[PDB]
Amino acid sequence: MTLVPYVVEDTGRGERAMDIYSRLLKDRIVMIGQEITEPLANTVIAQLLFLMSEDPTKDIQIFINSPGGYITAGLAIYDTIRFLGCDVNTYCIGQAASMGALLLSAGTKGKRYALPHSRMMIHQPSGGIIGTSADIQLQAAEILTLKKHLSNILAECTGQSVEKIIEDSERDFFMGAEEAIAYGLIDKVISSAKETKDKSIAS
Amino acid sequence: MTLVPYVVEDTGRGERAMDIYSRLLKDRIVMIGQEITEPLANTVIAQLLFLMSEDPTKDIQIFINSPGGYITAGLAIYDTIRFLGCDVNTYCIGQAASMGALLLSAGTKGKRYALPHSRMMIHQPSGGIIGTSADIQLQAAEILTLKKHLSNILAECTGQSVEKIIEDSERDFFMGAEEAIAYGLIDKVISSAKETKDKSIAS
Amino acid sequence: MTLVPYVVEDTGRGERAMDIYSRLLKDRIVMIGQEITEPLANTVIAQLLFLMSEDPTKDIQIFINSPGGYITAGLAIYDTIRFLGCDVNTYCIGQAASMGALLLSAGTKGKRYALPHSRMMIHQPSGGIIGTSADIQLQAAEILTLKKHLSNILAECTGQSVEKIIEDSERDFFMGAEEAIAYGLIDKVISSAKETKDKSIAS
Amino acid sequence: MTLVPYVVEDTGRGERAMDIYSRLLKDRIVMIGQEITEPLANTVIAQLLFLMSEDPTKDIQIFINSPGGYITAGLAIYDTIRFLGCDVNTYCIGQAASMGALLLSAGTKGKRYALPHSRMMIHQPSGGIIGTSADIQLQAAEILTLKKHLSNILAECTGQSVEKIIEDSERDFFMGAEEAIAYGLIDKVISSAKETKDKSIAS
Amino acid sequence: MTLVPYVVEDTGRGERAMDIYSRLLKDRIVMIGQEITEPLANTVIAQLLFLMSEDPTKDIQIFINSPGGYITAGLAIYDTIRFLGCDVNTYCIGQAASMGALLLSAGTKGKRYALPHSRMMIHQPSGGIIGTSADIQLQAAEILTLKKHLSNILAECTGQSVEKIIEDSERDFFMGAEEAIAYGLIDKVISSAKETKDKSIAS
Amino acid sequence: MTLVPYVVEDTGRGERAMDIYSRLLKDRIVMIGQEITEPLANTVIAQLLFLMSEDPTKDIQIFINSPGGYITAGLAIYDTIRFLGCDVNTYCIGQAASMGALLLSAGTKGKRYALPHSRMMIHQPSGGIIGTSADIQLQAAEILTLKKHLSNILAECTGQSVEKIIEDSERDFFMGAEEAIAYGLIDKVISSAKETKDKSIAS
Amino acid sequence: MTLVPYVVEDTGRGERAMDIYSRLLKDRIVMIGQEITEPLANTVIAQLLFLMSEDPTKDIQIFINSPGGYITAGLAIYDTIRFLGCDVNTYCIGQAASMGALLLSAGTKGKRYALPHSRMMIHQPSGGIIGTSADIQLQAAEILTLKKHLSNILAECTGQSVEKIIEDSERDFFMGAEEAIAYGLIDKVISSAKETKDKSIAS
Amino acid sequence: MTLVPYVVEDTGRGERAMDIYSRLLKDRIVMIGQEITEPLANTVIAQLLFLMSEDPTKDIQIFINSPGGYITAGLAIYDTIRFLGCDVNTYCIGQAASMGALLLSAGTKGKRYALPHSRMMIHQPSGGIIGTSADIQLQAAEILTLKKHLSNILAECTGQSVEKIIEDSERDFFMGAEEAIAYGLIDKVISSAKETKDKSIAS
Amino acid sequence: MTLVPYVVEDTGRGERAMDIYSRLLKDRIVMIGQEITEPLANTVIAQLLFLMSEDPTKDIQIFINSPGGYITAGLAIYDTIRFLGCDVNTYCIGQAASMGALLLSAGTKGKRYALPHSRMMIHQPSGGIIGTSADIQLQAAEILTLKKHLSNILAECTGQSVEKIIEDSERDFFMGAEEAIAYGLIDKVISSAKETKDKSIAS
Ligand SMILES: CC(C)(C(=O)N1CCN(Cc2ccc(Cl)cc2)CC1)S(=O)(=O)c1ccc(C(F)(F)F)cn1
Ligand SMILES: CC(C)(C(=O)N1CCN(Cc2ccc(Cl)cc2)CC1)S(=O)(=O)c1ccc(C(F)(F)F)cn1
Ligand code: NA
Ligand code: NA
Ligand code: NA
Ligand code: NA
C-alpha cells in the first residue's frame, strides 16, 4: 500500500499535476531511499542527466537513505555525479551504508551533510558480490576490480588511505555523524535547513 | 479495495485533479495512517521536504494513526521534523504506538493533540528496529545505539527521565489521552477545531 | 517499485505529465539500461525511428548500461543505428557487456565515450545461445550465421581482425576505459564538462 | 523495465500525452515486433483500419521483427493489408519468420525492404500449429485448408510455385537479405530511408 | 493420508499392501479413465508390456472411460495392443470418445463390450493430435499422415470405409451401445457379469 | 487437512498397513463422501470391480454422503452397480443430492436405507452440468439423451413416472427419510444394527 | 498426478513392493517415454549402469517414446549405451524425434525395431541445445562441437553421409517404419513378440 | 520431476524397497548429476562418509555429469574426497564443468576416466557467490582465498601451473577427452571395462 | 531436489530401509549441513537426546557445514551438547560461520577438527535479531542479552577474552584451519580418517 501523493498549485495562474518526487526534482532534489540496484541507478542517472540538461551550473541536492546496494550500480551513479559540472549536495537522513556512504561522500567537498541521528557505514552488509537474483553474474577478477575501484574512490573522497578503507570495509559497525566528519565521509552536522538549498526562480 | 478518492475545487480558472491525500497536503496536512516503514518514511520525508520548499514558516499538521514501525524509519522522520523551521502540529487519532508515539511527541510543545478515545504506547512490539522486510542486519552495538537514540529523544520530548522511558518501553500497555498529557507525550485533548488556537469565527 | 519521476517544462500553463525518460528523448537521448531483449529492441528501434522522423540530421545520444542481451535483438538495434543518417553518440555508464559493447562500438567514430570506472566486455556472459521468444528457436546453423554476423560487425567497428574478435569473445573478462580505447571499442574517456570532447550543443 | 517513452509536440505549446507507438502511428508507421497472435492481429488490424479512415491513399509503413505466429492471425492481417487501397511498405528489421515473412512479402511490390543483417524464413518455426491458448484449437481438415491458403498466398507474393513453397516450408533454415530478394520475399536491401537514400528512387 | 485405497488378500503364498489399481492388474485388468495423454500412454504401455512379460497368453481386460486424447498417444497404445499375442477384452463404461473409441474398437473381435448407458464418439472435440512437450506442433504432411493412420485403423477395426470414418469424424455426436454394435465399434451389450463370453474374472 | 487414519489386521495369515477406507473395503464397504466427479467414479468403479473379483455373490454396502455430481460420472457408477451380480446395500448418511440420490436408489430393492436426519434431493444443485466445470463436453442433442437416461433410470429405480421425475428434478428442495420412502428413493429408515439382515452364521 | 502402478507380483519369488517401471527393470527393460532432459539422462544412465552390474552380458531392451530432448543429455546416454558390453534392443513405440531417434538408432545393429505406425525424425525440433530458461546453455564453439558430434554419430549409426545427416537434420519431417529401415534408423518393423521368457506358461 | 525407479534385491532373501541411486551406492557408486550446490554437497559427503564407515579400503566409483556449481560446495566435497583412505574412481559422462571438473580431476591418479564424447571445462560459466543464506556480503580477501584454493587444487590435480589454471579458468571453452588427458584433468578415455585394481601390480 | 539416498543393511537379520542421514545416526554421527534455524535445532536436539538414550557414554561425532543461523537455536543446541555426558567430536567440513563456529568450538577439547580447506568465522554475517514469527520477534534488551551469552560462551570455548570475541565478531573475515587452531576454535587439522583415534573390528 505505497500511496504516492501528487502536487499541483494555484499561487498564480497554474497547473502542474506531478507526484511528490517529480516536484522535488523541480527544485533539483534527487531522492535515494532504496537499496542501490541497477534499476535505481538508471532512474537516478536519468534524473542527474536531466538536471544537467536544464541547468548545468545550478547546485543539485541529493538526499540519501540507503541500506546498501551493488558496486556496479553505485559506480555508475558516482561516475555520473563526477560527470556533472555543477556542485552536488549530499544529505544523509537515517542510514547510508556501503554504496550509500560512497554516494554521500561523493558530494562536493564542504556540501556533504548528515542529520544528528544519521548512521553511516562503509562495510557492505548485503549482496555478496551478487545479491538477489535481480542483479547477478560477477566472475572472480571482476569483483576485485570493482572492489579496488570502490576502495580507491572512498580513499580519495574521505581522505583516508586505501589500506585503512579496506580494513574498515571489513568491520560491521556504524559510525555517527560526528565520527563521520572526523573520518572524512561528511563535512557538517545540521539540524536546520542549511540554506545551500534556497532557489525560487532560475537565473 | 479502498478506493483513493479524488478532489476538484472551484478556483474559477484553475481546475486541478488530485487525490484526497494530495489535496490535504495543500493545507500542509500530512497523514501517517500505517506502519512506519522505510518506504513510508521516504514518502513522509518527501512530503515534509516539499512543504518546507513551499512555505518554510507556515505551520504543518501531521495526523498519526500508526500501529508502530521501525526505529530507523522513525528516526529519519523525526530528524526531518526537527530539520523543519516551522511549527509542527501532531494529532493522535486512534492509536499511536512506539514510532507513532515518537512522532506524536515530536511536535512543537503546546501543539501536540489527541482525540478523546485515542490510545498511545511507547513500547516497541516485536523487533521493529530497522528498515523494512528483510533489512534485518545487526550487530550488538547498533541496537544499543538505536535504542539509546530513541530513549534519549523520548526523554527529551516527553520530559521523563531516560530510565523511566526505558522501563516503560518494556511494558506492553496503552495509555489514554489524559494519561498521555501527564506523561508528557501530548499537551491537550480536543474534540473540535476551536479547542486548538481559536480564530474566533463569528456567529 | 522504482518510481520513474515525471517532468513539467516552462512558458506554458498546461498539462504535459511526461516521465524522465521521455523528457530526455526530447533532447534526442536514448537510454539503454537493462538486458538487450526483444521487447527492449522494439523500444529502442521505436525511439530511433521517431528521432529520425523529427530531425534526421541532428545528433543522437545513446547512454548504455547493459549487462548483455541477445544477438537477435542486438543485430536489430545495430542495423537501425546504421540505418540512421545522423551522428550517434554512445556513452558507456557502468557496464557494457556483449550486446551493450556492440551498440557502444556502433556509435559514430570519435563520438563513442566511456566514464572513468566503466567496464566493457565482448564475451557473452554467464550463459546463452542467444534467442528466447517464449521458445528458444535459432537452431544450430542459425546461431553460426548470427555469431559470424556479430564477429564481422565487431571487427568492423573496433578495427580488430575477425579472428581476434572470435578469440576474445570466448574470454570472460572486462576491460576498463583505457583498455577499450586501445581495443577500438570506444574513442575517449570522459570525466568532466571541460574534459568532454563531446561538446553537447543543443537546447 | 517496461516500454516507457512518450511524445509531445513542437508546432505549438506542447500538451497531449502520446506514447512512442501512437507517435509513430501519426506517421502511418505500424510496428510488429512480437509473435503474431490473435490479440496482436486485432491491434494491427485496428491500426490498419484507422489509418485507412484518415487517408485511404497515403502510403503506410509496416516494420516487422517477428519470430513467427499463427495462421489464423497472419491470414487476418494479410487480408486486411490486401484490403487497404493505398501502398504498403514492409521493412524487415532483425527476423521475419513464417507469419512475419508472409506479411513482409505482402507489401506492395517494389516497396518490400530488409536491413543488411535481417534474417527471413518461411518455415513455421519450432513446430506447426494446432493451437494452445494462442490459436484456440483446430480440427483436422481445417489446418490443412489454412496451410493450403498460406502456401497459395506465399507463392503468389514471392512468385515461386506452390510446390516449392510447401517443399521449402518444411526446411528449418533462414535466408539473408540477398537470398530473400532472389527468392521473391523482398525487393531491396537498404541502408537509408525508404528506397535507399530517398523517399523515392532515382536512376 | 494417501488417496487411492489399498488392499490385502491372496494369503496362499503370502503378499502385502498394494493399491486398488495394482489389484486389478493382478487380474490382468487395465484401467483407462482419463484423457489419453503421453504420460498416460507410457503408464498403459508399461502395464501392457508387463502383463505380456508374466504370461503372454492369458486374456487381458481393459476398461475404458475416456473423454478423448491425442492421436500420438492413442496410436502408441493401439500398436502395443496389436503387439500383444493374447486376447484383449475392451469394456466401455460411460464414455469412449475419439482415442477411447479407437482403443475400445481395438479389442479382439467378439470381446469388445459396452454397458447399456455407454456413449461412444469418433470425433475428437477440436484439438489434440500430439501430446507435445510444451515446445512443438506438427507440419502439414504430418497431420495428414496422423489423420490417415487414425482413419485407416478405425476403418479396419469397425469395418466401415475410410470415407465414412472421415465423414463421421467431423460430426460431434455420440452413439449408444446399440448404434455402436451396428457401426462396428463394439460387439455386445452385456449389463451384467454372468452374461456373454466373460462370466466375470472372479478368482 | 483430511486426516485418513490407518489400521492393522489379524483376519488372515498376512499382516500389513492400510488406511481406514481400504479396511472398510475388506468388509465390502464402499464410501462415497464427496461430489460425483470423473476421478471419483474411476475410484468407485475400481473398488466395485475389485469387490466382484473377490466375491461376485457376497453383499456390498455403499455409504453415500454426496452433495451431487455430474451425470456422466453417475451413469458410469450406476451401470457398474447394475453390472454387479450380488446384492448392493445403499446407506444415505447426511445428504444424497442428484447423483447421490441416483446411486442411493440404485441399490437392491429392500436394501436401500437412510439415517433419521438424512436429506435427499433429485434436483441437480448449484454448479456444473454433466462432466467438468472447465473441460466441458457434450454438444447439442446430447443433453437430451443424458437427461433422458437419468429420468428413465430414476423412474425405474423409484417407481414414479418419467414425467414426475422430470417435473421433480426441476425443484430445488430436499426431502426427509420418510418422504424418500414414499417417493421410492429408499426403503427403510434405520437407527440400529438389527435393521439390517445379519441372517446367520458367525463373522 | 501419480499414475505409476505397483506390483507384488504373481510370478516371482518372495514378497516385494515395487512400481511398474522397477518391475520392467527386473526384466532388463528400460522405458524412455518423455523428453530427453538432464534429470532423465541421469536416471536412465543409473538404470543402465545398474543393469550392467547385475548381468553385464544379458540383453537389455529399451522402449522409446520420446518427442525429443537436448544434445548434452542425449550424448550422455549414447556414450553409456556404447559403454555397455551387452546387446541393447531399441523399440520405437509412437514417436522417436531427434534425441529419441539417436538413442533408437544407437541400439545393436539388427536389434533396432519399430511398431507399424511409429514415426521417427532426426531433425532437432524447436531450437536450442540445452535450456528451459537457463539450463546449462553453451558458448559458440561448444554447441558446434556437440552438433558435429551428433551428426557424426547419426551418420555412423544410420549409414548415411554426414552431409546428408546435416541436410536432413534441417528438414522438419517424420518418416515411417519402412522409410526408417531404408534410411538406417532401424532394422525391422514388427507386430509380435520376440523377447525371452518364451515357450512357457506360469502357474 | 523425480523419476527414481526402485529395486528390491539380494541383501538376503530380497525384501526391501530402495531406489536406483541408493542401489548403485550398494556397489560404492556415487552419482553427481546436477548442479553442485550446498544441499547436494551434504548428500554427497554423507554418502562418502557412509561408504568409508562400511569399508574404508574398498574402491569408490563416482560418476560425474555436472554443469558446474559453487566453490564452497566443491571445496567441501574435495576435502571429503581427499579425506578418504581408499581409491576413488571418477568417470565423466557428458559434461563436467568447473566444480564437476574439480571433482573429476580429484580422483586417484590413474583412475580418472571419461567417455569418448564427454566435455570438460574448468571455467565457471556462471560465477558469483554461493547463496549460503541469500542474506550476506562476500568481501575481497574471501573470494581471493576461495579462488586461490581452487587454483591451487586444480594445479596440483592436473599438473599445470596455477598461472595456467587461472588463465584457462577465464576462457569459456570445453575440451574433449583427448585434450583433457593432455591437460591432466583425466587419465584415460574409455569405451569398455578398461582399468581396475584387484590383481598383482604391473611393473 | 537432492535425492537423499536410502540404505539397506543387516545381511543377517534383514529388512530395514533408512536414508543416508539416519544411517550415519546409527554410527552416532550427526550432520549439520545448513543454517542453524529453530526447526533444525529441534531435529538436532532430538537426535542428540536419542543418542544419549541409547548409549550415554559412547562418543558422538557432529559434522558441521553451516553458513550461520540464529542465536536462540544455536544456544539451544550448545546447551544440549553441554547437557550430554559423553565426548562430542566436532568436524568442520567447508564452512562454519557464527553459530556453526559456536557448535564447532563446543566439542570436547582435543576432539574439535577441521579439514584442510575449511573456513571458519565467528562474525554473524548479516542478521542477528534471532527468533521466529516471520523472522522478527525478540526485543532489544533481549538480543543484547543473547549476544552477551554468545560472547561469554565463545570466550570460554576458544580461550580468548570476551572483549576480543566482541571485537572479532564485528569483523567480516574468515580464518583457515591453521588460524582457527591458534584462535582456539578447533584443535587439530586432519586429512584422513585414521589421523585420530582408532576403529577396527569389534569384540
Ligand atoms: C571387467 C574387468 C574385469 C576388466 O576390465 N578386464 C579388462 C581386460 N581384460 C583382459 C585384458 C587384460 C589386460 C590387457 Cl593389457 C588387455 C586385456 C579382462 C578384464 S574390470 O576392469 O576388473 C571391472 C570393470 C567394472 C567393474 C564394476 F564397475 F562393475 F565395478 C568391475 N570390474
Ligand atoms: C572415526 C571415524 C574416522 C571412523 O572412521 N569411524 C568408523 C567406524 N565407526 C563405527 C561405529 C559405529 C557405531 C557406533 Cl555406536 C560407533 C562406531 C565409527 C567411526 S569417523 O568419526 O566416522 C569420521 C571422522 C571425520 C570424517 C571427515 F573428516 F571425513 F569428515 C569422517 N568420518
Ligand atoms: Na518495547
Ligand atoms: Na584500461
Ligand atoms: Na423424515
Ligand atoms: Na515408413
Side-chain angles (χ1 to χ4, degrees), chain I residues 105-126:
Chain I
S105 78
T108 55
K109 176 184 206 179
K111 303 217 200 154
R112 308 171 292 174
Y113 311 92
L115 286 200
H117 301 102
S118 48
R119 311 290 293 162
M120 287 144 285
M121 185 189 32
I122 63 191
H123 166 76
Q124 165 41 235
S126 267

Side-chain angles (χ1 to χ4, degrees), chain G residues 54-122:
Chain G
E54 280 269 356
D55 211 330
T57 50
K58 256 276 275 297
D59 276 29
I60 283 162
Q61 279 92 12
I62 298 190
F63 290 85
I64 293 177
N65 194 199
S66 178
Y70 299 111
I71 308 198
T72 48
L75 293 190
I77 305 172
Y78 168 80
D79 270 5
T80 307
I81 293 279
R82 287 290 176 253
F83 183 65
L84 295 185
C86 49
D87 280 355
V88 202
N89 304 13
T90 52
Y91 307 79
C92 172
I93 319 178
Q95 289 91 47
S98 79
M99 284 317 135
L102 157 69
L103 303 191
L104 168 65
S105 78
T108 299
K109 307 228 202 195
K111 300 190 176 157
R112 308 170 292 172
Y113 312 93
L115 286 183
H117 296 264
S118 302
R119 310 290 294 160
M120 299 144 249
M121 171 179 62
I122 55 158

Side-chain angles (χ1 to χ4, degrees), chain A residues 1-12:
Chain A
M1 317 96 60
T2 327
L3 314 90
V4 298
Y6 273 59
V7 288
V8 66
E9 310 191 330
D10 205 314
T11 60

Side-chain angles (χ1 to χ4, degrees), chain I residues 8-176:
Chain I
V8 132
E9 280 217 352
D10 249 6
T11 326
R13 216 230 183 253
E15 178 148 300
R16 17 263 166 226
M18 300 170 299
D19 80 338
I20 198 69
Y21 299 116
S22 319
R23 179 72 207 84
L24 295 166
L25 190 63
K26 218 190 172 253
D27 315 313
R28 305 181 69 82
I29 288 163
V30 179
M31 332 273 305
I32 302 181
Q34 32 165 316
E35 338 191 2
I36 299 161
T37 66
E38 275 85 17
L40 176 78
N42 291 168
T43 56
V44 168
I45 302 197
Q47 287 178 76
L48 284 182
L49 287 179
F50 159 71
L51 280 187
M52 84 144 72
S53 294
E54 72 104 344
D55 286 297
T57 48
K58 290 246 164 192
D59 298 12
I60 271 161
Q61 291 90 222
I62 295 180
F63 294 86
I64 294 171
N65 186 11
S66 181
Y70 297 104
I71 301 189
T72 49
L75 291 190
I77 303 172
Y78 168 80
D79 272 353
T80 309
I81 273 151
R82 286 296 182 254
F83 189 59
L84 263 44
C86 47
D87 283 1
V88 202
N89 307 44
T90 53
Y91 307 82
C92 170
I93 310 153
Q95 153 183 30
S98 82
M99 284 303 127
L102 161 79
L103 305 189
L104 169 64
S105 78
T108 55
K109 176 184 206 179
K111 303 217 200 154
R112 308 171 292 174
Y113 311 92
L115 286 200
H117 301 102
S118 48
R119 311 290 293 162
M120 287 144 285
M121 185 189 32
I122 63 191
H123 166 76
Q124 165 41 235
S126 267
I129 290 88
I130 310 313
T132 36
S133 193
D135 198 6
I136 287 293
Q137 279 285 49
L138 256 284
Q139 280 234 311
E142 189 50 35
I143 303 169
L144 308 161
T145 300
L146 296 186
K147 192 74 171 320
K148 268 158 230 150
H149 280 349
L150 167 67
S151 294
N152 295 349
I153 294 164
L154 276 182
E156 181 69 15
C157 287
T158 64
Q160 314 274 335
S161 74
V162 165
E163 288 210 40
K164 172 105 150 140
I165 289 310
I166 290 158
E167 167 169 318
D168 292 344
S169 280
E170 288 192 24
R171 290 241 164 231
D172 200 348
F173 75 96
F174 282 83
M175 47 197 222

Side-chain angles (χ1 to χ4, degrees), chain H residues 28 30 55 75-76 116 122 137 159 172-173 183 194 199:
Chain H
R28 307 179 69 82
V30 178
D55 198 348
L75 290 189
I122 69 168
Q137 226 280 322
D172 200 352
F173 67 72
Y183 198 94
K194 252 38 67 163
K199 201 208 54 210

Side-chain angles (χ1 to χ4, degrees), chain C residues 118-119 175-181:
Chain C
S118 304
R119 314 289 296 155
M175 41 183 130
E178 319 155 36
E179 295 144 292
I181 295 184

